[PDB]
C-alpha cells in the first residue's frame, strides 16, 4: 500500500487534493417537512457522488476489496456528510450551512418532528470545532478516520488509521503545540467523533421515518445507503 510510504505532508496534501467541493442547493427558506427534507435530500444525493470519488482518493481505501469499500461507505456516509456540515457551519454560530445558499437555524428545525434535537446537536458540535480552532488539515484527517473506522469491525485499515494519527500529530507539532497539548488536542478531536456517530444514528432514524412516510422522493442511491442501516 502506497499510503504507508507517504510522508505526513504527502498524506495531508493528498487528502486536501481529494476534497469534494461545497455544493449549492436550488434557489424560499424551508419550514415545511416536505420542502426542508426535499432540499436536503437533493443536496445530499449530489454530495454522495462526490463523496464516493473522494473516498477512492483517500490513501489506503482503494487497496481494500470492493465489498469492504462498499461496507465502509454504507456505514459512514451520514457521518461524513455531517462532519462536512458542522465544518462548513463553523463561521456561522447558531446556523447550519448545508449550502452557501441554504443557511438553516434551529427555528426551522422546529416545524419538523424530531428534527430540532439533531439540529442542536449539530450546532453544538460546530461550536465545539470553532472553539478548538479546528484547521482544514485536521478536518480532512478526521473525515478520513471516520471513513476507515466506522465500519472497521483488519490489519491494513489498522496501520492506515495509525498513519492518519501520526499525520494529525504532525500537523499539531507543525502548528507549534507542545507534546502535552498534542495528545490533549488529539483526544478532544477523537472524542467528538463519538458524538458524530451518535448524530448519524439519530439522523438515520429520522431519514428512515421520512422514507416510511413516503412524501419526499428518495434517490435509488440514497435508498440503498439508507437500507444498509436497516437492521
Amino acid at each position: 500500500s502506497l499510503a504507508l510510504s507517504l510522508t505526513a505532508d504527502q498524506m495531508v496534501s493528498a487528502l486536501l487534493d481529494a476534497e469534494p467541493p461545497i455544493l449549492y442547493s436550488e434557489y424560499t427558506r424551508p419550514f415545511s417537512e416536505a420542502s426542508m427534507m426535499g432540499l436536503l435530500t437533493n443536496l445530499a444525493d449530489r454530495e454522495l457522488v462526490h463523496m464516493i470519488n473522494w473516498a477512492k482518493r483517500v490513501p489506503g481505501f482503494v487497496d481494500l476489496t470492493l465489498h469492504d469499500q462498499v461496507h465502509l461507505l454504507e456505514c459512514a456516509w451520514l457521518e461524513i456528510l455531517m462532519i462536512g456540515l458542522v465544518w462548513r457551519s463553523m463561521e456561522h454560530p447558531g446556523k447550519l450551512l448545508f449550502a452557501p445558499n441554504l443557511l438553516l437555524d434551529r427555528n426551522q428545525g422546529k416545524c419538523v418532528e424530531g428534527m430540532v434535537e439533531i439540529f442542536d446537536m449539530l450546532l453544538a458540535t460546530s461550536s465545539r470545532f470553532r472553539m478548538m480552532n479546528l484547521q482544514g488539515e485536521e478536518f480532512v484527517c478526521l473525515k478520513s478516520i471516520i471513513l476507515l473506522n466506522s465500519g472497521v469491525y483488519k490489519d491494513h485499515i489498522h496501520r492506515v488509521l495509525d498513519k492518519i494519527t501520526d499525520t494529525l500529530i504532525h500537523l499539531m507539532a507543525k502548528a507549534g503545540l507542545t507534546l502535552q497539548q498534542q495528545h490533549q488536542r488529539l483526544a478532544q478531536l477523537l472524542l467528538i467523533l463519538s458524538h458524530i456517530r451518535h448524530m448519524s444514528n439519530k439522523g438515520m432514524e429520522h431519514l428512515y421515518s421520512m422514507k416510511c412516510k413516503n412524501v419526499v422522493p428518495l434517490s435509488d442511491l440514497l435508498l440503498e445507503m439508507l437500507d444498509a442501516h436497516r437492521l
Binding site: V49, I52, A55, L66, Q69, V70, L73, E74, E224
Partner: peptide, 11 residues
Amino acid sequence: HKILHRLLQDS
C-alpha cells in the same frame, strides 16, 4: 446489485 458497486468502479 448495488449502485455503490458501479460508482466505486469507474476507474
